[PDB]
Amino acid sequence: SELEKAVVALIDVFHQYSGREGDKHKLKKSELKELINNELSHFLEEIKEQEVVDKVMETLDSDGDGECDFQEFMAFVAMITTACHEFF
């Protein structure tokens, strides 16, 4: 179904980016920056300043280890999706 394909896509995109550097199952700041800039260009302003990268990570990093894990990424997707469902 389209829903199953959506679930597969969320897993795949997280792993494409999380696997680049360091912990292969978490997004460091550089990985999260590239994910947003490359994959969310219709929904979010391009990130071009360290201050914005820092603030985004600070927001998403609920457990405070400085990285975005899969559960934190799902919370981010839920934010984006809700903002879209409510833009209209």
The tokens for 24 are 């292969």
* Contact residue for Ca ion among 32, 47, 61, 73 (CB under 5 A): 61
Which three-class secondary structure string do you get for 30-74? HHHHHHHHHHCCCCCCCCCCHHHHHHHHHHHCCCCCCCECHHHHH
* Contact residue for Ca ion among 8, 15, 22, 79 (CB under 5 A): 22
Q: CB under 8 A: which stretch of 26-34, 52-60, 67-75 binds a second copy? A: 67-75
- Note the residues at the interface with a second copy (CB under 8 A): 1-14, 35, 38-43, 70-71, 74-75, 77-78, 80-82, 84-85
